[PDB]
Amino acid sequence: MPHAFKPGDLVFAKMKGYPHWPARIDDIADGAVKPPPNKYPIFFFGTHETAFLGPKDLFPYDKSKDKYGKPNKRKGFNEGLWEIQNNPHASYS
Numbered sequence: 001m002p003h004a005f006k007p008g009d010l011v012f013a014k015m016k017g018y019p020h021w022p023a024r025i026d027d028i029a030d031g032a033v034k035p036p037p038n039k040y041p042i043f044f045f046g047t048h049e050t051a052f053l054g055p056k057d058l059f060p061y062d063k064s065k066d067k068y069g070k071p072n073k074r075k076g077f078n079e080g081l082w083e084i085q086n087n088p089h090a091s092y093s
C-alpha cells in the first residue's frame, strides 16, 4: 500500500496551464527555504524549476507514465522526459 510522498519520489506534477510534467520531490538543503505547510518542493525536470505543490497535483511516475510520458511541444518537456527516465536522481544544479 502507498506511503506518504518522500524526497526522491518521481512524479508527473500538474500546474494550472501546463501539461502533467516529469518531476521529483526534492530534499530541502540545510539553510534553504522551507515549503509552506502541507506542500512539497517539486523539482521539474527539463526546465529545472522548483514549485511548491500538494499531493492533489502529484501523480506517481510508474503508474502515470503510460498516460503522461509522451513528447510535448512545450519548452523543456522532452529534455524532462529524458531526465526522469535516464538520471532522475542527479544534480541538475
Ligand SMILES: c1cnc(N2CC[C@@]3(CCOC3)C2)cn1
Residues within 6 Å of the ligand: 015, 018, 021, 044, 047, 048, 049, 051
Ligand atoms: C514561469 C513560471 N512557472 C512556470 N512553470 C510552472 C510549472 C512549470 C512546468 C515545467 O516547469 C515548471 C512551468 C513557467 N514559467
